[PDB]
Design a binder for this molecule. Structure first.
Ligand SMILES: *[C@@H](C(=O)O)[C@H](O)C(=O)N[C@@H](CC(C)C)C(=O)NCCC(C)C
Length: 212
């Protein structure tokens, strides 16, 4: 597993988005991983629909949260539409998958990373972008604007994001705040603290899709 991984370099991550005033972090998280995995297999980099997860994941709660695992669970069964064809509106509405033609993509299943093990998280990110959670409500986090982030922060995770890289000292994360946040929309969180939870509770719950 190399000392460095950055999926952006191998053209596996799309531009950073802004979730706005809706708690659809869980959907944005899920989409980073789908978009990653499809490009890893097919060589194509496509933009996929956050809005659709938002509208169709019964099991989550639209704006004001849900679960990326649930979310990844739906593309495996059904599929997902391109972001062009099912645009983000930042409001939950009816599920219109149907109205929009055949799926653009389908995934083959979902897997969870062994929790509270840096090693296991690092291994997965070596293979493809992964869905992860952390505690984002503290003001140090919100105020971040470039930097190796070591907190302060607690372990009460409340915000799903995606890990798209790592270094000797950090894990790379794509946030769903604008491009105006942290590092052009990214955050480098310090690793190897040797805390099992991870900084801000980073190792609490990670998932990635499986495809052919
Ligand atoms: C993340 C975002 O800021 O959009 C979003 O609020 C979210 O999904 N939050 C939740 C995680 C899922 C359980 C919904 C949420 O529940 N908030 C508290 C998280 C844990 C229960 C502490």
């Amino acid at each position: 597993i190399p000392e460095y991984v950055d999926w952006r370099q191998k053209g596996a991550v799309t531009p950073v988005k802004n979730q706005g005033s809706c708690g659809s972090c869980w959907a944005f998280s899920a989409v980073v991983t789908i978009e990653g995995i499809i490009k890893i297999r097919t060589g194509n980099l496509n933009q996929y629909s956050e809005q659709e997860l938002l509208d169709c994941d019964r099991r989550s709660y639209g704006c004001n949260g849900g679960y990326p695992w649930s979310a990844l669970q739906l593309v495996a069964q059904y599929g997902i539409h391109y972001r062009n064809t099912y645009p983000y509106e930042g409001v939950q509405r009816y599920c219109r998958s149907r109205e929009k033609g055949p799926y653009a993509a389908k995934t083959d299943g979902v897997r969870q990373v062994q929790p509270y093990n840096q090693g296991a998280l690092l291994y997965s990110i070596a293979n493809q972008p992964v869905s992860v959670v952390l505690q984002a409500a503290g003001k140090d986090f919100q105020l971040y604007r470039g930097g190796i982030f070591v907190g302060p922060c607690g372990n009460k995770v409340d915000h799903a994001v995606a890990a798209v890289g790592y270094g000797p000292n950090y894990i790379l994360i794509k946030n769903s705040w604008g491009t105006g946040w942290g590092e052009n929309g990214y955050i480098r969180i310090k690793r190897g603290t040797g805390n099992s939870y991870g900084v801000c509770g980073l190792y609490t719950s990670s998932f990635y899709p499986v495809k052919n």
